Design an enzyme around this catalytic site. Structure first.
Site, PDB file in Angstrom:
ATOM      1  N   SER A  45       0.835  -1.203   0.000  1.00 58.41           N
ATOM      2  CA  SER A  45       0.000   0.000   0.000  1.00 58.41           C
ATOM      3  C   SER A  45       0.882   1.270   0.000  1.00 58.41           C
ATOM      4  O   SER A  45       1.678   1.435  -0.936  1.00 58.41           O
ATOM      5  CB  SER A  45      -0.984  -0.029   1.156  1.00 58.41           C
ATOM      6  OG  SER A  45      -1.941   0.989   0.959  1.00 58.41           O
TER       7      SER A  45
ATOM      8  N   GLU B 174      -9.054  -5.368  -4.098  1.00 56.52           N
ATOM      9  CA  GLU B 174      -8.386  -4.176  -3.596  1.00 56.52           C
ATOM     10  C   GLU B 174      -9.281  -3.129  -2.919  1.00 56.52           C
ATOM     11  O   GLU B 174      -8.923  -2.611  -1.874  1.00 56.52           O
ATOM     12  CB  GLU B 174      -7.583  -3.495  -4.726  1.00 56.52           C
ATOM     13  CG  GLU B 174      -6.365  -4.252  -5.209  1.00 56.52           C
ATOM     14  CD  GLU B 174      -5.202  -4.296  -4.243  1.00 56.52           C
ATOM     15  OE1 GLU B 174      -5.318  -3.730  -3.134  1.00 56.52           O
ATOM     16  OE2 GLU B 174      -4.172  -4.909  -4.595  1.00 56.52           O
TER      17      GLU B 174
ATOM     18  N   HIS C 101      -7.409  -5.659   0.593  1.00 53.16           N
ATOM     19  CA  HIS C 101      -6.154  -4.932   0.565  1.00 53.16           C
ATOM     20  C   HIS C 101      -5.427  -5.165   1.910  1.00 53.16           C
ATOM     21  O   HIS C 101      -5.986  -4.911   2.983  1.00 53.16           O
ATOM     22  CB  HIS C 101      -6.518  -3.439   0.328  1.00 53.16           C
ATOM     23  CG  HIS C 101      -5.395  -2.456   0.238  1.00 53.16           C
ATOM     24  ND1 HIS C 101      -4.667  -2.289  -0.934  1.00 53.16           N
ATOM     25  CD2 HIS C 101      -4.991  -1.526   1.137  1.00 53.16           C
ATOM     26  CE1 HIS C 101      -3.811  -1.305  -0.692  1.00 53.16           C
ATOM     27  NE2 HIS C 101      -3.971  -0.811   0.540  1.00 53.16           N
TER      28      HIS C 101
HETATM   29  N1  LIG Z   1     -12.357  10.923  13.140  1.00 57.05           N
HETATM   30  C1  LIG Z   1     -12.467  11.053  11.796  1.00 57.05           C
HETATM   31  C2  LIG Z   1     -12.848  12.295  11.267  1.00 57.05           C
HETATM   32  C3  LIG Z   1     -13.017  12.471   9.888  1.00 57.05           C
HETATM   33  C4  LIG Z   1     -12.743  11.412   9.002  1.00 57.05           C
HETATM   34  C5  LIG Z   1     -12.314  10.088   9.567  1.00 57.05           C
HETATM   35  C6  LIG Z   1     -12.196   9.961  10.962  1.00 57.05           C
HETATM   36  C7  LIG Z   1     -12.033   8.947   8.620  1.00 57.05           C
HETATM   37  C8  LIG Z   1     -11.659   7.631   9.213  1.00 57.05           C
HETATM   38  C9  LIG Z   1     -10.321   7.230   9.228  1.00 57.05           C
HETATM   39  C10 LIG Z   1      -9.986   5.979   9.768  1.00 57.05           C
HETATM   40  C11 LIG Z   1     -10.974   5.170  10.348  1.00 57.05           C
HETATM   41  C12 LIG Z   1     -12.312   5.585  10.353  1.00 57.05           C
HETATM   42  C13 LIG Z   1     -12.651   6.820   9.783  1.00 57.05           C
HETATM   43  N2  LIG Z   1     -12.118   9.132   7.187  1.00 57.05           N
HETATM   44  C14 LIG Z   1     -12.004   7.978   6.255  1.00 57.05           C
HETATM   45  C15 LIG Z   1     -10.586   7.649   5.794  1.00 57.05           C
HETATM   46  C16 LIG Z   1     -10.532   6.398   4.925  1.00 57.05           C
HETATM   47  C17 LIG Z   1      -9.281   5.611   5.266  1.00 57.05           C
HETATM   48  C18 LIG Z   1      -9.305   4.201   4.689  1.00 57.05           C
HETATM   49  C19 LIG Z   1      -8.322   3.369   5.474  1.00 57.05           C
HETATM   50  C20 LIG Z   1      -8.580   2.848   6.719  1.00 57.05           C
HETATM   51  N3  LIG Z   1      -7.477   2.225   7.114  1.00 57.05           N
HETATM   52  C21 LIG Z   1      -7.232   1.469   8.332  1.00 57.05           C
HETATM   53  C22 LIG Z   1      -5.787   1.026   8.388  1.00 57.05           C
HETATM   54  N4  LIG Z   1      -5.673  -0.400   8.549  1.00 57.05           N
HETATM   55  C23 LIG Z   1      -5.633  -1.210   7.471  1.00 57.05           C
HETATM   56  C24 LIG Z   1      -4.411  -1.339   6.628  1.00 57.05           C
HETATM   57  C25 LIG Z   1      -4.452  -2.281   5.462  1.00 57.05           C
HETATM   58  N5  LIG Z   1      -5.519  -3.104   5.266  1.00 57.05           N
HETATM   59  C26 LIG Z   1      -6.663  -3.038   5.998  1.00 57.05           C
HETATM   60  C27 LIG Z   1      -7.749  -3.851   5.682  1.00 57.05           C
HETATM   61  C28 LIG Z   1      -8.917  -3.735   6.428  1.00 57.05           C
HETATM   62  C29 LIG Z   1      -9.034  -2.874   7.520  1.00 57.05           C
HETATM   63  C30 LIG Z   1      -7.994  -2.022   7.865  1.00 57.05           C
HETATM   64  C31 LIG Z   1      -6.810  -2.057   7.119  1.00 57.05           C
HETATM   65  C32 LIG Z   1      -3.253  -2.377   4.538  1.00 57.05           C
HETATM   66  C33 LIG Z   1      -2.012  -2.227   5.394  1.00 57.05           C
HETATM   67  C34 LIG Z   1      -1.970  -0.873   6.076  1.00 57.05           C
HETATM   68  C35 LIG Z   1      -3.159  -0.555   6.978  1.00 57.05           C
HETATM   69  N6  LIG Z   1      -6.462   2.287   6.157  1.00 57.05           N
HETATM   70  N7  LIG Z   1      -7.049   3.032   5.122  1.00 57.05           N
HETATM   71  C36 LIG Z   1     -12.559  10.437   6.616  1.00 57.05           C
HETATM   72  C37 LIG Z   1     -12.662  10.667   5.157  1.00 57.05           C
HETATM   73  C38 LIG Z   1     -13.048  11.934   4.671  1.00 57.05           C
HETATM   74  N8  LIG Z   1     -13.221  12.151   3.340  1.00 57.05           N
HETATM   75  C39 LIG Z   1     -13.266  13.007   5.557  1.00 57.05           C
HETATM   76  C40 LIG Z   1     -13.207  12.822   6.948  1.00 57.05           C
HETATM   77  C41 LIG Z   1     -12.824  11.587   7.510  1.00 57.05           C
END
Ligand SMILES: Nc1ccc2c(c1)c(-c1ccccc1)[n+](CCCCCc1cn(CCNc3c4c(nc5ccccc35)CCCC4)nn1)c1cc(N)ccc21
Ligand SMILES: Nc1ccc2c(c1)c(-c1ccccc1)[n+](CCCCCc1cn(CCNc3c4c(nc5ccccc35)CCCC4)nn1)c1cc(N)ccc21
Ligand SMILES: *[C@@H]1O[C@H](CO)[C@@H](O)[C@H](O)[C@H]1NC(C)=O
Ligand SMILES: *[C@@H]1O[C@H](CO)[C@@H](O)[C@H](O)[C@H]1NC(C)=O
Ligand SMILES: *[C@@H]1O[C@H](CO)[C@@H](O)[C@H](O)[C@H]1NC(C)=O
Ligand SMILES: *[C@@H]1O[C@H](CO)[C@@H](O)[C@H](O)[C@H]1NC(C)=O
EC number: 3.1.1.7
Lengths: 534, 538
Positions: free
Chosen positions: B203, B329, B442
């Site tokens: 990633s 993905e 992913h």
């Molecule tokens: N408090 C707050 C305020 C505002 C927002 C958010 C949170 C969030 C948010 C971020 C993380 C968890 C929950 C919610 N997002 C969403 C962000 C999306 C992120 C997607 C993501 C989440 N994770 C978790 C990391 N862990 C993982 C990882 C991987 N695989 C996974 C597979 C399943 C579950 C978790 C995995 C690959 C390896 C690395 C980390 N990694 N990428 C927003 C998007 C906006 N447009 C605007 C505002 C916010």
């Protein structure tokens, strides 16, 4: 004299000819006048009904073919010559043909009316592939075909004028439909069971009769073979028709509509034909100079508007396409294509071909076509590029307009049956790369394989017999399925939900779903949004 | 010393280390965890490039993992293994610039090829201490020297005020580079060959690996590269200098910092770490998924030009690259922001929910571009089918963000002299707790490459243990030779290199290698060739 060859029609008496079909005789009434010759002052004018005649009019031979451009691409070649006029060219060409069983049907028989194709610039009802003797003999059908004015003569319009209003070629067809209502019962035909059938420009004409109220009362069912009223080539705007008529008038030395049309009327027919091709706005293929005009009269609005808003509740329609719709069009204008070589093209030749094949497309729209039709696994493969070029032309012009028409009619109450004709005639002289080209199903529907002298295979004779049964069962009942055959596979109606269609080939019926659904979503939904927003 | 195990005492440029003898299923391994590679990037050093760690006195205890870099903790599904396995497993601290080293036990007599892991987590999260990044199996079974480092994530690693001295951006990538320099100088002390270093990551980690390929000062610190489900090119891995300036100024505003760069950065440095984290997500320009607030910036320094420009014009002649993707993905990204999606229901969506999802999934798309996506991904036979729409939504996100950027990278590198090997990982772990609709999400190949199925306590199947062993062999053969194939095992299907002509790649599943052609060729022609032209024009 033979009483079976003597018919009295409203204009007077006629004498037909007894013709021999493989399985027995037929009565043929050829060259029946249905209109006053549209000559002199009547050039460009709507047709007038033919005045009554004295004595017995001889109806034993085909009459003159309407004045048209004669193809000289491959001179003497059966492949091109079979579509070329087989009678003298004349502006006096408004005659129709009738084939009936011999003896004359005892009870009223369903009527099939053929409307030929040829881009509205060419054709005749006298061509060998339109011979009604087999359908009449084998299926006991009353078959009618008429000549209608083509080119400048049938479709040159100065919209809003009274002298050249446009769509007069379609009015010639309508008058032959009015003739049938008035006189077909004299031949044993049921005026109350009339099915229109046509191919290419003929199919577009059939569609235009569905979309024009005064025609709607002259037929009950319709067959649209490889053509539609909607689409890039079947119509022009009143503006584009005015532009083209004014340009041709300039080209033939004609300097007010009355004044301009009067001058056009003084010009010999061949002068008009000689300049016909010089009025197209771009270098193009599958584009014809004088075609039906959206006049706000014959066509109250564009065919797209009419098919989207129309009520098609008490209508039955049989529609379909051939395996390779766009293949022959490529040898008539796309660099790198010939009937004499395998036509393996380069990527540059393909991009060049897409601009000719989709002449109304912007740089971005043409790129969208190229990126959709490229096989990103073999993007330089000449065979894939040659076949992709055929697909672009066939899909854009025929397959996707047919899919759009089938969809709108089904959604708006019509009973629709759709097919894909996939059998290549054993007798075909075009190269194998051309596949099943546009127009090469006609000879099967008309039953030409049934003549042993034509050297088709036994399988092809059984297949033609099958096709004649679908078409005549459709004309009889509005359903191509045999009510006798309690055996599978049934031909299901095409619906917006299931999108069912059948394969017409040597093998038994096969039911498939979605007529190039993804690709036609591209042409019918995406590409208009591309030429719209920008 | 004197009473200690002699196999755990090692000296590095900074001083003495004492490691720990760990148990791997097949025998012992040496681990040296929490080695400092930089001066803690705290106080005045926040947002600044890392400085090499000054030498220490005495024997530094390197038996435990150190602090995880200050980051946002996920609380989407609290208590759920599916989310908590990715969450920090050590204290959050700004003092987090430490690395880990696993080597066989006893240490190899001859120089061993080195594998350096760069973790993912959208450049906002991650740690090298997570259980799925455990180097004990690769070290034990394959005799590899495995290194993983912590790098600053979020505002701390990627907040940039481009052109400033105080916050130049890409400092998280500089922390990675510093750990790479540390490996060149010190890895030979552990039995590692500094002349055979393979970077591998997933990633944001894979994007980081790609950014080291595209940045000259890094190019001399490694010889080979593995990019798992991530690339430097693409919609999420980088931002413009303008967009980074916009985001840093907005976060400053949100935390009470009035905008001069010196003045603004000085104020940001006075703010508690948690305040910066608490506001991190509030600077994204649109409602989006697969978009992260502080990511590498195209600064004209670490990145001389955009990754697209660099991959199109670069000479990659003496470069061997292993690239690939997982079966599904984009599936997990949907539960983190797309209405109608949950891990707790079958997530069957409506057409309206699909159109709504495409705008969130492709946030930079115009009305026409979004229509192009919708028309491409619709099944015009069943355009209302909830299962097809749910699966199309996962495909839009996965293809846009991962599959097609990978296909573009494999294409450009192959065309420009590189030896590329491409894969598709299609095996769903028997132990997975995410719903079946999510498929192979992913990040869920990592545990196989690292060899976690080899631990009997983890309850994977026998087939999965044989499969992990196979994967560890591909990766380590690749690190050793630049070819994942075993020259001894000639019968076993050969993994052909990916070329522009043949477009070959393999299926990585329980069944033997299967060679396929074209990595989602038609759809990626849509994303990589058409859609950009739908921005260059309208
Ligand atoms: N408090 C707050 C305020 C505002 C927002 C958010 C949170 C969030 C948010 C971020 C993380 C968890 C929950 C919610 N997002 C969403 C962000 C999306 C992120 C997607 C993501 C989440 N994770 C978790 C990391 N862990 C993982 C990882 C991987 N695989 C996974 C597979 C399943 C579950 C978790 C995995 C690959 C390896 C690395 C980390 N990694 N990428 C927003 C998007 C906006 N447009 C605007 C505002 C916010
Ligand atoms: N003399 C002259 C001057 C200028 C131009 C042209 C000719 C021609 C041209 C027209 C007809 C034949 C040969 C050439 N076009 C080419 C465009 C017409 C080609 C399309 C076409 C040609 N034909 C032949 C008609 N016959 C056929 C028909 C059918 N099938 C067929 C299958 C194979 C071969 C012929 C078939 C089914 C329906 C009946 C007609 N049918 N459609 C132009 C295109 C421009 N952009 C500009 C100028 C010219
Ligand atoms: C096919 O023939 C024509 C001339 O007859 C020529 O222009 C064209 O290039 C030829 N194509 C090939 C593939 O040789
Ligand atoms: C049919 O074939 C015979 C030769 O077997 C030939 O004499 C005849 O002219 C052919 N007819 C046609 C129309 O091909
Ligand atoms: C799944 O649950 C969430 C709420 O927990 C809801 O928004 C979504 O509509 C549900 N989907 C289905 C298919 O039930
Ligand atoms: C493994 O299985 C046992 C049951 O035999 C169970 O008690 C234990 O919690 C499981 N552990 C894991 C990691 O799944």
């Amino acid at each position: 004299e033979d009483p079976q060859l003597l018919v009295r029609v409203r204009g007077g008496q006629l004498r037909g000819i007894r013709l021999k079909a493989p399985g027995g005789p037929v009565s043929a009434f050829l060259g029946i006048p249905f209109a006053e010759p549209p000559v002199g002052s009547r050039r460009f004018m709507p047709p007038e009904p033919k005045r009554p005649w004295s004595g017995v009019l001889d109806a034993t031979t085909f009459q003159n073919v309407c004045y048209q451009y004669v193809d000289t691409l491959y001179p003497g070649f059966e492949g091109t010559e079979m579509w070329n006029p087989n009678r003298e060219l004349s502006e006096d060409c408004l005659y129709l043909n009738v084939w009936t069983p011999y003896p004359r049907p005892a009870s009223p028989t369903p009527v099939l009316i053929w409307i030929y194709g040829g881009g509205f610039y060419s054709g005749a009802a006298s061509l060998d592939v339109y011979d009604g003797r087999f359908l009449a003999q084998v299926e006991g059908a009353v078959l009618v075909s008429m000549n209608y004015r083509v080119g400048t003569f049938g479709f040159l319009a100065l919209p809003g004028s009274r002298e050249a209003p446009g769509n007069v070629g379609l009015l010639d067809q309508r008058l032959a439909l009015q003739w049938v209502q008035e006189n077909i019962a004299a031949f044993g035909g049921d005026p109350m069971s009339v099915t229109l059938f046509g191919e290419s420009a003929g199919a577009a004409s059939v569609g235009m009769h569905i979309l024009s109220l005064p025609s709607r009362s002259l037929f009950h069912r319709a067959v649209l073979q490889s053509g539609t009223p909607n689409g890039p080539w079947a119509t022009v705007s009143a503006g584009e028709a005015r532009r083209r008529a004014t340009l041709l008038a300039r080209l033939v030395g004609c300097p007010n509509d009355t004044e301009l049309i009067a001058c056009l009327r003084t010009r010999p027919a061949q002068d008009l034909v000689d300049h016909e091709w010089h009025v197209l706005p771009q270098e193009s293929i599958f584009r014809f100079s004088f075609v039906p005009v959206v006049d706000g009269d014959f066509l109250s609005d564009t065919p797209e508007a009419l098919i989207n808003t129309g009520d098609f509740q008490d209508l039955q329609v049989l529609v379909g396409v051939v395996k390779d719709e766009g293949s022959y069009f490529l040898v008539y204008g796309v660099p790198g294509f010939s009937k004499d070589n395998e036509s393996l093209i380069s990527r540059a030749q393909f991009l060049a071909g897409v601009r000719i094949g989709v002449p109304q497309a912007s740089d971005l729209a043409a790129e969208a076509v190229v990126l959709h039709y490229t096989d990103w696994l073999h993007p330089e493969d000449p065979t894939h590029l040659r076949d992709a070029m055929s697909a672009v032309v066939g899909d854009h012009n025929v397959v996707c307009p047919v899919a759009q028409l089938a969809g709108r009619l089904a959604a708006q109450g019509a009973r629709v049956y759709a097919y894909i004709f996939e059998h290549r005639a054993s007798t075909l002289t075009w190269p194998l790369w051309m596949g099943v080209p546009h127009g090469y199903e006609i000879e099967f529907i008309f039953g030409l394989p049934l003549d042993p002298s034509l050297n088709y295979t036994t399988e092809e004779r059984i297949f033609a017999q099958r096709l004649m049964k679908y078409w005549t069962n459709f004309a009889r009942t509005g359903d191509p399925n045999d009510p006798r055959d309690s055996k599978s596979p049934q031909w299901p109606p095409y619906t917006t939900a299931a999108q069912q269609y059948v394969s017409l080939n040597l093998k038994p019926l096969e039911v498939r779903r979605g007529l190039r659904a993804q690709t036609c979503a591209f042409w019918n939904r995406f590409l208009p949004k591309l030429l719209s927003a920008t």
